[PDB]
């Protein structure tokens, strides 16, 4: 149905399970319950969210399951193969970002150049 909503800003991967409303969902990473009751503040679960802080590409990347409490993980609609290289403030330059940066750069440059040209022409 509704796919997962992966949100990565820096060293924090926030998985979101939009399906299964009105129930306590649980996560599972490679047949291992994560985000539950474990003495680890890096992995957290709250309101169908999975916050993995300080994400690792080696040990914290694989298949992630989201299933309501009392149901078997093999009854989920689909799985999620998460493979992502995270950073401390590594940005993502997509098409719209470079487009808007280029257009604002050229507009600012043209405006400033025209202003200086008109000022130097009118000063004499």
């Amino acid at each position: 149905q509704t796919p997962y909503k992966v949100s990565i800003s820096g060293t924090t991967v926030i998985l979101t399970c939009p399906q299964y409303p009105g129930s306590e969902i649980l996560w599972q990473h490679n047949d291992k319950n994560i985000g539950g009751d474990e003495d680890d503040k890096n992995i957290g679960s709250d309101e169908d969210h999975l916050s993995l802080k300080e994400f690792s590409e080696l040990e914290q990347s694989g298949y992630y399951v989201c299933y309501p409490r009392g149901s078997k993980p093999e009854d989920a609609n689909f799985y999620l193969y998460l493979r992502a290289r995270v950073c401390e403030n590594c940005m993502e330059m997509d098409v719209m970002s470079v487009a808007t940066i280029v257009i604002v750069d050229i507009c600012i440059t043209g405006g400033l150049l025209l202003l200086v040209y008109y000022w130097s022409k009118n000063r004499k």
Partner: antibody
Framework: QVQLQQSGAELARPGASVKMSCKAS????????MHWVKQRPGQGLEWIGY????????NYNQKFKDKATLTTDKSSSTAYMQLSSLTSEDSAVYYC????????????WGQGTTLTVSS | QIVLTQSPAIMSASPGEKVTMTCSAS?????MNWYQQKSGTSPKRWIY???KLASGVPAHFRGSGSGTSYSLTISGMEAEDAATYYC?????????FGSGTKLEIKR
């Protein structure tokens, strides 16, 4: 392994407030949840609701909503169920049970408390 | 809200026969657990995951099933099987029990 202790016979009035308890010991209480079951004399079992001892996630159904409130305590690793606005059909037996995730069932129960209400 | 209906409500048979119990579900569930409760005591886990046995239950208890209807067979009755059995599933959102079957020993 898991043994759950429940109170005895508790006396109340129609419309009063009762607060029964389930006493857990012998295991990691914060890792397993607790479900509450109601059994009236002459009928089967009906699930009331459950609570997660980790953060306090509560879940009930439409029949027991606005009627029962579940709390949990870690200083004694116990559970409490508070009822209010009682009537005749509230007099029943209440059990508490531990849920096993790897077994998908209620493995251990309690002896239950007999609630008698009358005018 | 998958209502669990147990059709064989009242069962009476002689010790040593093969008696079975059916629990029908309104929707297809993933599993089914069976709890046993005698008169004047608390229920207990009898069969979980629809194929496994608890600790202390004799080996003649054998139930299985799939889809929307599940069965529980008795490979020989003794003087202990006189109790009430409840089918339960939490595959859907809420926890649900069964109507309950009263199994008594004939003579």
């Amino acid at each position: 392994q898991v043994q759950l202790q429940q109170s005895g016979a508790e006396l109340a009035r129609p419309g009063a407030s009762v607060k029964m308890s389930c006493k857990a010991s012998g295991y990691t209480f914060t890792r397993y949840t607790m479900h509450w079951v109601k059994q009236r004399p002459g009928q089967g079992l009906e699930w009331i609701g459950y609570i997660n001892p980790s953060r306090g996630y509560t879940n009930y159904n439409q029949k027991f909503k606005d009627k029962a409130t579940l709390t949990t305590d870690k200083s004694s690793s116990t559970a409490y169920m508070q009822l209010s606005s009682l009537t005749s059909e509230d007099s029943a037996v209440y059990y508490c049970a531990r849920y096993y995730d790897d077994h998908y069932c209620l493995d251990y129960w309690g002896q239950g408390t007999t609630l008698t209400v009358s005018s | 809200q998958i209502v669990l209906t147990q059709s064989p409500a009242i069962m009476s048979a002689s010790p040593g026969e093969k008696v079975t119990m059916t629990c029908s579900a309104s929707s297809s569930v993933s599993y089914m657990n069976w709890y046993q409760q005698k008169s004047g005591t608390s229920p207990k886990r009898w069969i979980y995951d629809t194929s496994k046995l608890a600790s202390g239950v004799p080996a003649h208890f054998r139930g299985s099933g799939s889809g929307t209807s599940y069965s529980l067979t008795i490979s020989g009755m003794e003087a202990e099987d006189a109790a009430t059995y409840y089918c339960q599933q939490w595959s859907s959102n809420p926890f649900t029990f069964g109507s309950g079957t009263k199994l008594e020993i004939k003579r």
